[PDB]
Symmetry: D3
């Protein structure tokens, strides 16, 4: 079995959907055509999903870059060819990107440490074009409007008052949203020859937390739509390996 995911090597499928919360895996599996529970160790919950005639895993990665890298590395080392992250994020453009909007991301800010322990900082955190295109084409089929943009993947959720957060700089640089894992996924994927992407639902705006605008309200219909897009994309991408 995989060292920490505890799934057997034979159970790794070419396409894998990753999400942060183990609870979310259980909410996703029930919208599929069927599923098989595989393993649950620590924050890493794994389920084989069957959807639109195809088979792909759904696996939880936990909160944050160092914990997710364990997950991503084990998947890449054991046969995953495509990894899509579906997650939540905060808006960095509060005039234009609002609660419940959906972002399909192509690139990310490497505000982690593990990516830098693997490759020099100059190297880009970028997703695969094809995966990105597939996500966007599924959103278009379902008539679900989306945003595209760069995510800031930051290891600091709660800022302090000594070293300024770089969020406002990145907003000024036209980064769309903020989350905690996509850059890490993208860099590990490039290093390991695994295609990656990301789709995110907006939940709040960090620049408006002092007015209670937190990440505490996933708009249920929007969340459903994102999950449909994510599952759709997985199934289409899975067709090529099947």
């Amino acid at each position: 079995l995989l060292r920490h995911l505890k799934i057997s090597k034979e159970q790794i499928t070419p396409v894998v959907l990753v999400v942060g919360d183990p609870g979310r895996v259980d909410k996703i599996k029930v919208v599929c055509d069927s599923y098989v529970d595989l393993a649950y160790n620590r924050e890493y919950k794994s389920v084989e999903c069957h959807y639109k005639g195809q088979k792909f895993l759904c696996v939880s990665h936990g909160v944050g870059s160092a914990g997710c890298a364990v997950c991503f590395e084990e998947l890449c080392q054991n046969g995953a060819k495509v990894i899509i992250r579906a997650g939540s994020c905060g808006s960095l453009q509060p005039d234009l990107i609002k609660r419940g909007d959906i972002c399909i991301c192509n690139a990310a800010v490497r505000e982690d440490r593990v990516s830098h322990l693997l490759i020099h900082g100059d190297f880009p955190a970028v997703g695969d074009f094809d995966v990105y295109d597939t996500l966007n084409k599924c959103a278009q089929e379902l008539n679900v409007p989306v945003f595209n943009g760069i995510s800031v993947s930051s290891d600091m959720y709660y800022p302090n008052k000594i070293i300024p957060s770089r969020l406002e700089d990145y907003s000024k640089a036209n980064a769309a949203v903020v989350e905690m894992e996509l850059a890490t996924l993208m860099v590990i994927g490039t290093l390991r020859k695994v295609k990656t992407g990301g789709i995110l639902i907006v939940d709040g705006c960090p620049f408006k937390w002092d007015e209670g605008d937190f990440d505490n309200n996933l708009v249920p219909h929007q969340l459903e739509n994102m999950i449909k897009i994510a599952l759709g994309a997985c199934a289409k991408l899975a067709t090529k390996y099947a």
Copy 2:
């Protein structure tokens, strides 16, 4: 309630025992005199422990620095005065520190990113003396031999072959062991005026993974002893606030 731990603010006790695996919380609570299950959200499982006449929380932090910082910040922001981490680690001194040995750590290598987003790199990751002394005195009472030393807290579990891992440098520098969260705990604690410490059980040696010497075997009697020391210390420290 706490934003992500989902425990009420009134339920935060002055002493908190933190561990990585939510499963471990359930294995610890049953050795206490009694417990009350509080919350379980994502990888964060919280239980109020009653032991030796005192009351303290036990909370899981997940794998890795960015995820644990969410936990630690919420505890520090909402009344925790003392936080002890009990965890596993890898030996960096394989001639002297073997499987199942126990290390009580006073300081850590800041091979994360969140600590650096809070305070300049020059700042030390150090535990509180008193907590460290309390842990050591509990180990002495129970006649459990221990090691003391510095932990390397690294965000990279799986190294690649491009950028060398710094583990061998840190071994040469006399770091004892390697894990993934203690530096983060220590720096947040200093910033927030919360006393911190760490006790760790050795599980393998990264320098001998090519010969199967992994972190996959917690020596059961040694693990029990460490948990007894950790609970003992918590109860003693809790007496001062009670």
Copy 3:
């Protein structure tokens, strides 16, 4: 007029093709349907191209990031909406990417300085999806095989023997090719809300310069094909603004 390009502000078109060598501008204009010479100052030669019913500039940027940034900034500040770089590059994968092969790049290594004087290093150098897709679809129409991949954009052409070149690290990281300007273009474009891309012809392999495998032979038919793809893409993208 533009401060250093010396073209009038009214002459900036929404799509601009950029190339390094002022000589190349003169070789490109003659394959268009017609052209108007605009300005030539320093290494910056500007010509208005007419191709497939559309109008776009072709402008030389010179060798290297700091010099090209002057060009790119003036174009972005004065109305350019899309900038495609067509250039030469060296292979970083000599088993697979050979002389005369064509690469359509989506992202780049920021081994410059100007990008870092504009935005933190963690920020990705990424092209626009749409531009990348347009280039690839033009190559497919013309039946011209291409490679896709990340470019290392390095400010050092001639390495010395004291500080190792990072080319081999980036090859190991799966970077495809090496050139000198694309990262700079990409970052300025993101900062300025200008869509960017890159198409490159392989000319040699730096890892085989000790055996004379230099950047001194642009395969003439391959160069023609790349230029056709680049012009094709420009014309298609120009249609949206016209």
Copy 4:
């Protein structure tokens, strides 16, 4: 003889008290039971102290990290097992830590360069627990109140107005005091398997130098008390090797 200290190798004792000013060595020796003058070269004055039945050296290190490292390295290379620094420092918490207060430090900010030329910045500057405990227990025996905390060891005494001093950041981070050598001592000690500590007398507050609150007044009774604590600790620690 030692290369720069000029003391013979046979004269190095297991415990060594270090101080900045060669003049201070002469003021310390006369409070001991007896002494033997050993060497005086450059700013490095060495005297063998006899106190409470034990024998330990007292050696001056000069002002600043690079000069003190020469001293510390020679002592560590030639048999020193324990090194305590006794020095002066500035308050970083002027509401709570006043002129003449005494701080027993456990850790330090590495705002030097030599420590970084020996080991990566992430590594902590931490003292030995036992030494720290011994100092604190001697202060308690003598009924001398003390502070405990982190020292900022900075190579810049006189700030200029271009690059902000980091003192206010470190004050906000709960650093207690500022001096110039302790981090250097601590890191060399960890690297060389030598136990280290630090005791410091407060002399001024850098944040109030514009109002004349300089380091120009060592409160004589407080200085005596600190020196008594330092000598006491040395003698107790020396007992273990004797």
Copy 5:
């Protein structure tokens, strides 16, 4: 021939005058006693100048550090012993250094990337004394007042509003002027055992661009004087090798 300069190796003279603009080479050659056009490739224009009985090349380097390094390396690799840059620059001391003033520079700020890819940042960008002395003595002979000082060689011409430009810091540090290539020249020269210098004409002040005080007016008589000084110096230095 030289790889990118396209001049033959036999045509490299011991002294070389370098300038940014290929147009400037043509304006310089006509003030010499005679000249021979050698090559023009990309932005690199080369002419053999005959002046005061001596022979030296004049070669254009283009805008910016990465492009100029190609030029400088090829000259240093193929026999150049002395390289003087004559260029334009911006004032960083607008009270004292005005439009058209002439600066003979001895050292430079390394705000590039190629110098850092060749040697650690701590290493100084410094010119040769002798070259500097020769320039100053030629200015004195011709009765042309000059300034001496440090140049900031920055790869960013157009600053943005996210990361502050360091120009004001360097002004406060007593840097005289700003340009884009001298540091690069100086470091390559030291690495290659080639003597270097720099003479610059002031054209504007970046701190007053918001009031139109741009680099768009080379005072014609002052420019003539600088070029006379530069040619004078070249001829004197050339005498030693002839």
Copy 6:
């Protein structure tokens, strides 16, 4: 009085000769025409020298950058206009620069920390031309051969085996010699509008310490010659202010 030098402000002369060892001040004063002892505090010994009709101070700075900066700042803040350092150094070119050779330095490697706490790393550590010229012209008058070159000013005297020393890199970069203070002097001088220089006697070669080639033998006649050159230069420079 000066805060730490303890000399009165009225006693600061426009030219100051600085040396590391307080003992050396006493050996220099006796070769002057006469002297007046001024102050001796810590490692800082100050004497007013009278030589060739002029008056200048000689002041000891101690070992290392952070300690010397206190000295240099106080001199620059209180009227010093010219500061020459005379010191010892190690050869980085053992084939060409031998024991007892004399180097007159124009620039330095900033391998300290205080310079970086005052100004960005890109800024050069360079001496004043005039001072350098004066030193060289005094050596020529006295028929004393000298070397000129860049000094590596490093805060680490005793390297360890974890992080490689940069000495060999700097040797390859054509640095001549190694010492511990000149860069610091040069940067403080530029910041404070004080002219600086450096003259150094070679004592050993760090690359040959494993064969006993230490800094433990100042060739007495060569040392005399250097001191004569240094005093000569001071007197000439002092004439301009007198």
